[model samples]
Structures are given as structure tokens and as C-alpha cells.
Target chain A: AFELPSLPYAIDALEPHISKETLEFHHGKHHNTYVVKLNGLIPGTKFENKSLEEIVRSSDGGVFNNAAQIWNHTFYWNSLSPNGGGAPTGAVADAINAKWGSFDAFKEALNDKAVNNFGSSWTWLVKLADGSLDIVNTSNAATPLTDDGVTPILTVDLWEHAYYIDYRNVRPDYLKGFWSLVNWEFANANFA
Target chain B: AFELPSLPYAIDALEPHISKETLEFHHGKHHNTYVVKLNGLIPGTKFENKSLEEIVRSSDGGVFNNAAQIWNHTFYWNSLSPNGGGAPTGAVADAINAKWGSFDAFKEALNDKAVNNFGSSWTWLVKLADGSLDIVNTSNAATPLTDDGVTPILTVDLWEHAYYIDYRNVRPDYLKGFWSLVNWEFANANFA
Candidate 1:
């Protein structure tokens, strides 16, 4: 059975930009639901003993939904930090400037992808085989990592469950909040 | 040039189940955004001066998204009442009984559709060409009324924005809340 990963930071660590209360329920309640449902679905089936990444790559239907959701939320948790929300540094910074021309340009490009993405989905920053950074949006439980020659660097969930408690109907405000608390250390780590 | 329609009931009227806060944002904020964006998109384009339905029927891209969202939410407002959550008692009842065998069975059937429906969508009870009741679900900005020979009897929005503030991630509770406030009067009126 796939277990819900413990959040990398305490629930209260992300605050003001994201409420302590937001993480309390989002991690405990929403992420827990996906993990529970995946376990329930996989037992007595072909997916009974597979890892989450394995299940995500091979599964379809509800099996894929829960498995991918588990993977994404785990990645999403790692993407944030109590010490986040500055411009990229080190090689990640070099790569950002290389692809998008400037840090400011990269911010506008990702926000553009996040804003145009409609419904339950995710916005990702990934590295392609061509060795360039790109912003990708995936519908529902889809993840870019499912495709070959792609390495996921960062993802922010666009599902209402991700921001509704803090931002309500104004997703642009939530996008602003995401930048405020976004974990550059995580991005740097994923970059390498 | 389409106007956002006034809600049929006071925002406070659907209280305790769907909170006043929920309506304030869902209607005043969320629905109003669609109208505002549609107007902005159409005025300088081919879609200028079209009715909301005309925009939905004949338009594509962002034009269709906002137009259909406006239509669906307007119809959704009519689907609830301060006085709801009872058995059907008219020709609508005749049709429900004719299709699902019993009222409780129909309840089970509709809720099942609402549950299995993934992503942002609407679960509808519609009239088929043969004069029987069937449940239909459409994702994002889609509606059954767009098709010929199908009439929408009832619809409940599955979008998280529809229930996020009041119920957060617990959609089953929201569905129960929807049942309590669902207007059978509107259902019957639409049935004929």
C-alpha cells in the first residue's frame, strides 16, 4: 500500500502567504484522501505491491488518478519551504536566464502558464532533453514526468483544493502568494 | 454585451447548507468574472454584441469558455431553493419514476454520477429524445442544452469553486448539501 508522505516542513511553517490552517487540511485531509483511495483501489489487483512512481507510469483510470495525485502532492510539498520565494540561484539561475532571457521574464512566462490553465490541474517547470527549461500545465492528475526525456523541477497544483482555503475565487492572488513562498532551494536541488 | 443575471434567491436564502459566504463569492465574484471577461474578449472581436447563448453555441476558445460558464451558473442558480430536498411531485416525478424505478434509486443514480465525474464538471438529469430521464455529465464549460433533442432538467456543479469555501475538499458532504437545497420546482418547470 502506498503511504502518504510526511510533509517536508511542519504544517504551520507556510504562513501568511499560505495559512497554517491551509496546510493542516490540505496535507492531512486532501492528500490523505488520495493515498487512502489508492490503497483501497490497488489491493487485490495488479497494482497491489507497486511503488507510487511505478503505479503512476503504468496505471490508468481511477488507479492512475489516485497514484498520480499522491505523487504530485508529495512533489508539491517539497516545492515549498518556510524559507522560500526569492529568485533562483546557482546553476538553476543560469538555466533560467539561459532559456527565458531574465529572471523577470521567467516569472512572467510561468505565471502566464498558470493563469491560462483552467479547471483541476497542475503547472510544472521541467527540464527537457534539449536541456532547456519550460513551463508545462497538466489536466487533473496528469504529470509531465509520465513522458520520457522530461525531468520535473517544480510543480504547483492548480486544483482548487490547493488554494481555495487561502485565496478563494481569486487565483491570480494565489499565484502571487505562490511566488511569495516558493522554495528556491527545492528548485535548486531539483535542478541538479 | 451580455449581463450577469441577478440571482433568483437572496444569497442568504440557501444558508446552513450552502453558506452566504459561498454565494457571495460564487455569484458576485466567480460568475461576475465570466461576464467581465466575455465582454472584454468580444468587444474588439468577431464575437462582439452576441448574446450569451449565441456566444456559447457559435464561439470557440476563451469566448466559448466564459459564455458557457455564464450560462451554466445562471441555470445552476435556478436549480436550488430555500425550500428544497424533497421528492418530486409532478410530471418530473412521473419521468423520474419511469426511468429509475424509485425516487431513492434515482437519488442513488444521480449521486453516483456526481461522484464518478472527474475534474470540473456538471452532473445533469436530462430528457432524452425518447422522453426518458438520463444522467449526463460535461466537463468545464459544457452543457447538454447545446445539443438538440436533449433538455436539461437539473444540474449540480462539481467545480470546487462551487463548494470550496463551505465544504473545502469534502464533496460528498457538498452533494448532500446540494440535495437539501436543490429546487425540484425548477426541475419540474424545466421538464415540460
Candidate 2:
């Protein structure tokens, strides 16, 4: 029932921060497999007619694993832009500063979460129920969407496949580079 | 108290099945980081005086994460041999025939577990309390060593780092090559 979403930017858009080779395998292969597996798994099943997000929120086992990965990868693709970074932009920047007293502190805190996220995961900047921002680490197909009253504003993919080709085993380098590719425009839209 | 163990085989012994570069990163970096982190985390803690296996069986959170990974990676390295495969050997071969009817079927079953192990994990061929063999998948630093009566016989790492450099996203190709490197002598000894 789900299809792989096209990356919002050209494959080379995030170069230096991430490599085109990394994007080729990551988007063309890694992300596409989740779409294919989610599709393969849902036929004649209860999830067959459900939306990817719904399947993600309501399922368990293989279905949830593949479904959540699809949503997470799609969100991850949209979370980057060639035109991004410099200073955190718009409302998300305002919240990041208010929450951590400065953009540098917020990036440092988020980098820690993403680096120490401990295995395949997405590190998210989420808006909590009280509208305060929080950084969360969700492992292996886990996402903030499953939590009540949390809206993901920005996320960095921490799964090794997300950066392994470009940065090898150095995940903190990837985390530091993520700031350069941050799609604060999409994040700002998500924040509102 | 713990140090990264020297590999039983030269880094290139696994050869074409796994690249020297893969070993450099997988062992030199990935496995060594776990050892370094475990040592860093253990100083002055109760775990400081405990053995790696003891810490693996008793600890939780980051301690368990790093400790278990060190043990698992060491086991993973020991699990391979340049002279391995062709036919399963010794007592483990007998067990495989009894359990799965033949070595091919057994390798087939094991490879399936390794391929679908989901995220960062180790797919283990374990000997349960009954001394009967079973294939199980444990995610992210998890190992059968912690189970009351489970004895781990062999394992293949499913973490992307294990094969990503050599095989990219094609894990099945990597799993296929694994049979050629399966240290059956190691499996035979573990079975006893």
C-alpha cells in the first residue's frame, strides 16, 4: 500500500555534508526496500487499505517495522535541504533558543542524542504536549509520531546506513554535518 | 579492565568474503570502540572489577550495551575462519543434520535469520538447555549469554556496519558469503 517517496532534493544536494554515493544507496536501495517490504507485507492483511502513517501507528511486528521505517525515511528525506542551516531558521529557531538558551546549545544537545542514540534510530526535535521542544532518540523504526501529543519538527537519521558510506563509523561527524543540511523550512512548517 | 582482544586470524584472513577495509573499521573501529567505551564506563563502578561476561550478564543501559557488544564482536570474529564452510563439520554437523536434516537446510535457515534479524543485531545459532540447537535473532548488543540456560554456538552480525562497505544494502549477498567463512571448528567447540 505504500510507495517510496522521492527525495525532496537532488541526490547531490547535500554534498560534503553527505555524499552522492551515500544518497544513491540510502534512497535508491535502503529506503526503497522498506517501501517494497511494507507493500509486500500488507496485501490481504488488515493493513492493506491503511495509510502508511496509520499502519505505523496501529501495527506491530514486521508490519510496524517496515511501515515505521517508510514514514521515518520519508520524513528524513524532507528534513534536509541544500539551502538549509547557517542559523536555525523561523519559529523552530525561536523555540530551540528558548528551550536551550542558544542555537549552539540546542545543536549540541541534539547532536548528543543523535550520536548516543544507540543503534538504528531517528533523533528528533519534537514539540511536546506543552509546546516545549524536546530532543528524543527512538531506536530501530521507533518514531515520535507514536507518542501522544508529540509533533516532530526536525529529525536526523541515526541509522548507520544514513551516514556510513560518507562518514564510516564516525557518527558524531555525521551528526555535526546534519546541521548544515537541516531543512528548517520544512521544520518551521512542521512547528506551526 | 577490558581491552580489545587481538583477532585470532589476521585482519585479511576472511579475505574476499570481507574486505581488509571492512575489518579495519569493523574490528579496529566498531569493536574497539565498544571495548574502549566499556572500559571508560566501568572505572570505579561495581562493573569495574567484573569480567566482561559477568558484566554482560548483569548490567543494563550503556554498560550492558558496550559490554555485550564487546563480547558479541569478539565471538563474531572467532566465529569465522578462512578455511571454513563447504560442509558443516564435527558434532555441530551431526546436530545440524538431526535438527534441519542437512547442512544446506541448516545454512538456509541460519541465513534467513541473519538476513531478517532487523536493525543492528546478532543472529545466533544457540544451544538451548536441552542441548538442542536453535537459531535466534537478538537486536543491538543482545546475546544469548544472558539467558539462564542458553549457550550460544555461533553468530553473524546483522548490523549494517558488518557488511555495508562490502555489500552496500545487499545483505543476502553478504550472508551468502558468510557460509564460506563460517568457522565450523568454532561452532563444534561451542556445541561441546
Candidate 3:
């Protein structure tokens, strides 16, 4: 019964930063297809009635891929806010400053990871076991959840399809736009 | 001093089957960036002055990825033709039929590989050392050249960026379009 989740924000809410057209294709089409395929693949299997996260953690190959993408895209949607970007406050801010000296420095490192990601992937700001904030990149349909003690606070998709319409090959520009739309509140809540 | 290679046909030539807009971005931007990066990455290294194929074969990590993509995209451009699709003719046709029972069946197999490729990748028709034809898919930035005794004859780019603009997320439609634009003349030449 896994289904495509409705976007938290209107499709055009992130416009200029992320286009309505890109959302239409990325969410309405791309995310929906993964949900459909995941539903089809899970039917009658041990995974038929499992949670999406459970399917992601236990499955391999195509099953893992579809399940993980469904989860990743859902999280990616929530990670952005129409009022996102700028500096963080509270506990998440303390974590960022401790790890990378300043919010600007942390943003630079995260942007570097996002830009240098060579292929389809997501760049995440995650909480490690030691309570430190770290930036990591996961290839294809991989996620921080697959690893022990890595809690994802935020992410920016580095797949070409993520920014090809709005930014073309200039991923740096897309990364810049991502900063403007990041849900620091979501990140702070994840930290807490 | 690697440079972006020109397309064999005009950008608009594959229209309807593949839009000119797709070509401009896929070739003009995506492939061109690979060449630029490869040149930058190879300088002051053993790869300096070596051929693109040599770089693809021997380099590791980012260098190999950029080098292989440059080679792969060039081959991808040549693998398509305005006169492609239908049944492959002459020796290539005989080889395909002998291996897969019929041209239609072979197409089905190739499309399966392309449509089912999970992320950024390419589905190729290659010739093995045993003189048999096979369909294979390679993940992001990987090429058959990495393997011994396999020679790529034709390819369809399966990267989301390859078809996202033209077909959105309907990869099957893109795969269908690929059949009509495949360059059998170029494939036959490679076959010989």
C-alpha cells in the first residue's frame, strides 16, 4: 500500500529556486513511478505489508532501490521550506558551529560535497554517533539510514535531473539555490 | 587539451525521436564538461598526453569517470542515426538473430535493460571475445572498456538527464524513441 505522498509545499512554492516544472516532473512523475514500482515489487512478497523503511533496510537490488528512493524523495521534499536557507539557531546551530567553525564554513563544505558528487546522489548533513554534524554523499538510491548511527538532518539531491531544468550543468548554482530554500527548522528538529 | 567533439549530424536531425534541445544539453553541456574536466584532471599526471580511451582504461575514481563519460558520450552520439531503428541489417542482423532468436526479441531485451536501469547508466550492445553479441548495462560512468575482451557497438544513454526533458520520467517512451534513432550503419561498421 505504499503510495506517492503529496508534497508538503505547493509545487510552485519553491519557484525560481526550484521550478514548478521541475517539481512536476521530479515529484509527480519520478517519485510516483518509484512508488508504483515499489508497490508492484512488494506484492505477495515478504515485503508486501512491511513499512517503507523496513523494506529499505532489508531489501536488496531493485527492491532496495525503489524503496529507498521513495523514502529519500519524501524526505527531500520535507527538507525544503518556502522559508528555508540562511543560518540556523538553537541546538542545530551549536552543532554546526562546533563541527565547521561557522555556519558559512559548514555551508561551504556541504556545497562542495553536493557539487563534486559526480553522478546521481544526495548530499546530506547528518548527525554522527558522537553528536557531531558531518556532510556526506550517497550514490544512487543510498541513504544515511543504511549506515549505523548516521541521522540525516538535511539533504540536497545532486542528481542531474534534480537541477537540470533550473540550473543545467551548473550544479554550483543549484547548490546556491538550495541554500535559499533549506528548512533549517526541519534540520533543527531532526537534531533535537 | 581534449576538446568537445562535434556531433556527426546536426543537433536537430534526430527530431521527434530525440529533440534538438536534449542534444544541445546532453552533448553541448554534459559531454563538453567531461572533456574539460578530463583535461584538467590529466595534467601533470601519467595520463597527460594519453588518449581518452587510455585514460578510461587505466585511471581510477573521478579521472576514470570523467574520461569514460567523454568516450561514452561520443560513442553514444555515433550510435544514433536519423535512419536508425527497424531491424538491423547484414552481419549485425544475423548476429542479433542468432543470439536472441529474432530482431524483435533482441530489441525487447535491450529495452528491458534500458528501462530497468536503476539510475544513471547506459545499455549497450557489445561484441564479446567469443564473437557473440550481448546486451549489457553499465552503471554511472562505467564502460565496457573496463572489462577485458568486450567491445561496445551501440549504446542508449539511460541517465535521467539523458531523457528527463524530452520524456520526463517515462523511460519506456525514451527507450522506444531510442530504437528509431539507433545508428545501424555505425553499428555495422563497428561490427566489422
In candidate 3, which residue ranges exceed 4 Å CA deviation?
none
Runs of candidate 2 exceeding 4 Å displacement: none
Model 3, span A1-192: residue lDDT tens: 987999999989998899999999889988998899898898889999889998899989999999999999998998998988777888998999999999999888887888888789999999999989999999999999888888999988887878888887789889888888999889898998
- Tell me the lDDT of model 3 at A38: 90
Q: Is candidate 1 or candidate 3 better by lDDT?
A: 3
lDDT of 2 by residue, A1-192 (tens): 567778888888899898999999989998899989888898988888878888889998999999998888888888888998678877888998889999989888887777798988889999999888999889899889899799988788888988998899998888768878888899989999
Work out the TM-score per prediction.
0.97, 0.98, 0.97
The native-contact fractions of the candidates, in order shown, are: 0.84, 0.74, 0.58
Candidate that scores best on TM-score: 2
What is the CAPRI rating of model 3's predicted complex? medium
In the order shown, what is each candidate's alpha-carbon RMSD? 1.3, 1.0, 1.2
Q: Per-candidate DockQ versus the true complex?
A: 0.81, 0.85, 0.67
TM-score of 2: 0.98
Q: Model 3: how far is A1 from its true place, Å?
A: 1.2
Ranking by TM-score: 2, 3, 1
For model 1, residues A53-163, the per-residue Cα lDDT tens digits are: 989999899999989988999999988888888777888889999998999999999998898898898999999989899889999999986999898998988988788
Clashing pairs in 2: none
